[PDB]
Design a binder for this molecule. Structure first.
Ligand SMILES: CCCCCCCC/C=C\CCCCCCCC(=O)O
Ligand SMILES: CCCCCCCC/C=C\CCCCCCCC(=O)O
Ligand SMILES: CCCCCCCC/C=C\CCCCCCCC(=O)O
Ligand SMILES: CCCCCCCC/C=C\CCCCCCCC(=O)O
Ligand SMILES: CCCCCCCC/C=C\CCCCCCCC(=O)O
Ligand SMILES: CCCCCCCC/C=C\CCCCCCCC(=O)O
Ligand SMILES: CCCCCCCC/C=C\CCCCCCCC(=O)O
Length: 582
């Protein structure tokens, strides 16, 4: 039917097509020059215009993969540069393309991208703003070959809108930097979420994934019927598999097909989809995936009815276990948008466990009559933690809240690197700052969202440089008990204090010229070292030492001649503190 290129070109528009072709090629030819890819893009774009003018034009009939594959193999250096990958050009289609996906190197050997000065950046932006955005688009795409292209394009437009609104302000840095930080964090989270979902699919199986998807979908579309939700879980599962495989083209088609489906049965799924279903092809699925929870019917029976009281349960269960259990989740999840998905799964595993013990006993109904009774504690566990932690967060504020976490975790896993403990504690604080501003009904979902990517990054790291069997236990265990296992970590009684070191607790006046972020990291780094040296110190002994240090920095940063007060009063602080911490 017609021409694929022409079609995609008409749907996307020239501007989007060119930016997407750039990203796609950058993700395969990660080592080729920018000017080389631009040549490529122009060539393909010109070809695509040929097809838009005449569908019968040469090669215009060819499939996207084939056209794409032919273009890659057309690169001169290829073998000289990539070597192995060049041998892919010797194969037929299904093979050739699969051969390229295998050589798509994740975690390249490229330099870190350094953020330029707001001024140089803004000035480059005013000059060729297009080549300014494409170069960076190219730089980020080659470093993240797995990042879904259209999404990367959505972030790029937000960056563009920020340079536009900021490069014209009185104080540019004041405007730009703050939003460049939000975008970075946002981009890293999305990137991590993505690897997280794919790793989970791989590590735990499609069953676990389907369970997660049912719960998640039911919270969002509480009005949808179970048959509808199972339909979506199935398709959603096929989408994640191919999108994880890395094949951009297949992934995009599956996503478009799904969003189209959902939009066509809009009224049969959710009322909060109107906006998203009006958007262009490029942003539909992305919009839908971010859509807000629809409101629940209000005309819903009780869970006790069909799952706890009604005999006919084991019968209905033995008939199709997973389906029955899926029904339980659907029912429980659409009634609880306020629960995290993992909590929902813990309740479902608990219920499964019960049906599996009771349905085989003499009087079934009398064995599982009090099951909802066993849910209470599972539910209270996270709620209580969130309540306790957000109260504390509101008490001391972000920075001081980060310190509280710092002391807490260093004490639980002293074997961890100081820079890693600092990074972890800081990220956790931002979660507290993002999620505690929410009402009690949106807090667990918020925390789950952020905590999962933080806990995963943590584990992949530990997977590389192991440090504690305890961490490994929590990291390799069930994805449903991952967080509870970390919450259960106890202070490390075993650990042996790190012998004193003055260099470690030696401060200089430079901490006064430092920026807010740099001196925090400076102080926090020391705080971790302090706890690693005297792990048996009280929250109070520590508060006292931290207070003595506070005034220290003050009565020395505001003193005539610094680098001395710092060595004089410093010697004192350390000698006195050593005594306090007996
Ligand atoms: C991990 C991918 C998510 C990040 C999205 C990036 C989108 C790229 C679009 C335009 C380039 C912006 C140029 C500014 C670079 C500064 C990057 C940084 O702060 O780390
Ligand atoms: C229709 C699809 C039904 C999916 C199966 C339903 C419920 C199973 C409940 C247990 C969830 C297991 C998660 C796996 C894990 O322990 O990590
Ligand atoms: C000849 C060269 C052919 C190169 C192929 C270009 C690839 C173009 C587009 C792929 C991305 C399509 C985006 C559709 C959005 C669908 C969605 O996820 O909702
Ligand atoms: C979050 C749960 C996703 C909700 C609805 C499915 C939307 C379909 C679009 C595909 C997104 C693929 C990831
Ligand atoms: C509102 C979230 C509060 C975030 C504060 C950051 C401190 C992290 C420590 C404990 C938070 C525990 C939250 C547990 C909910 C995750 C979902 C789950 O496991 O059910
Ligand atoms: C040397 C680097 C290797 C990686 C080491 C991993 C370090 C883990 C450090 C701290 C654990 C994070 C705390 C997890 C949140 C649990 C929530 C709670 O407190 O209830
Ligand atoms: C027995 C070991 C003695 C070590 C010497 C102690 C010197 C003090 C060292 C580190 C304190 C770190 C400061 C953390 C509090 C930051 C709070 C704030 O910003 O005001």
């Amino acid at each position: 039917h017609k021409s694929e290129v022409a079609h995609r070109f008409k749907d996307l528009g020239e501007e989007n097509f060119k930016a997407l072709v750039l990203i796609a090629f950058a993700q395969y030819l990660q080592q080729c020059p920018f000017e080389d890819h631009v040549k490529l893009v122009n060539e393909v774009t010109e070809f695509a215009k040929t097809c838009v003018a005449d569908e019968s034009a040469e090669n215009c009939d060819k499939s996207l993969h084939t056209l794409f594959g032919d273009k890659l193999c057309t690169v001169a250096t290829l073998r000289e540069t990539y070597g192995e990958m060049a041998d892919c050009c010797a194969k037929q289609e299904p093979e050739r393309n699969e051969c390229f996906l295998q050589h798509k190197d994740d975690n390249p050997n490229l330099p870190r991208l350094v953020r330029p000065e707001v001024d140089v950046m803004c000035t480059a932006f005013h000059d060729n703003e297009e080549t300014f955005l494409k170069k960076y688009l190219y730089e980020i795409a080659r470093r993240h070959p797995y990042f879904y292209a259209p999404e990367l394009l959505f972030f790029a437009k937000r960056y563009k809108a920020a340079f536009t609104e900021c490069c014209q302000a009185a104080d540019k840095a004041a405007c730009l930097l703050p939003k460049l930080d939000e975008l970075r964090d946002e981009g890293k989270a999305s990137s991590a979420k993505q690897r997280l979902k794919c790793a989970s699919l791989q590590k735990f199986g499609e069953r676990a994934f389907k369970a997660w998807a049912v719960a998640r979908l039911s919270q969002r579309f509480p009005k949808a019927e179970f048959a509808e939700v199972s339909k979506l879980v199935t398709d959603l599962t096929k989408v994640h598999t191919e999108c994880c495989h890395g094949d951009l083209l297949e992934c995009a088609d599956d996503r478009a097909d799904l969003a189209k489906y959902i939009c066509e049965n809009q009224d049969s799924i959710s009322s909060k989809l109107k906006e998203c279903c009006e958007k262009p092809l490029l942003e539909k699925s992305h919009c839908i995936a971010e859509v807000e929870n629809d409101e629940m019917p209000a005309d819903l029976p009780s869970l006790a009815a069909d799952f706890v009281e009604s005999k006919d349960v084991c019968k209905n269960y033995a008939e199709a276990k997973d389906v029955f259990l899926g029904m339980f989740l659907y029912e429980y999840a659409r009634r609880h948008p306020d629960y995290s998905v993992v909590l929902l799964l813990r309740l479902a595993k608990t219920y499964e466990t019960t049906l599996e013990k009771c349905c085989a006993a003499a009087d079934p109904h009398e064995c599982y009559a009090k099951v909802f009774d066993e849910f209470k504690p599972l539910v209270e566990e996270p709620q209580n933690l969130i309540k306790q932690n957000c109260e504390l967060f509101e008490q001391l504020g972000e920075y001081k809240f980060q310190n509280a976490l710092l002391v807490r975790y260093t004490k639980k896993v002293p074997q961890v690197s100081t820079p890693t403990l600092v990074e972890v504690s800081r990220n956790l604080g931002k979660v507290g700052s993002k999620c505690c501003k929410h009402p009690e009904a949106k807090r667990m979902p918020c925390a789950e969202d952020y905590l999962s990517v933080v806990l995963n990054q943590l584990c992949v790291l530990h997977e590389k440089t192991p440090v504690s069997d305890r961490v490994t236990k929590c990291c390799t265990e069930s994805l449903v008990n991952r967080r509870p296992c970390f919450s259960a970590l106890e202070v490390d009684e075993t650990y042996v204090p790190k012998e004193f070191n003055a260099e470690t607790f030696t401060f200089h006046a430079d901490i006064c010229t430092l920026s807010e972020k740099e001196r925090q990291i400076k102080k926090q780094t020391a705080l971790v070292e302090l706890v690693k040296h005297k792990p048996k110190a009280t929250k109070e002994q520590l508060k006292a030492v931290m207070d003595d240090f506070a005034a220290f920095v003050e009565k020395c940063c505001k003193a005539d001649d610094k680098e001395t007060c710092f060595a004089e009063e410093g010697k004192k602080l350390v000698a006195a503190s050593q005594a306090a911490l007996g």
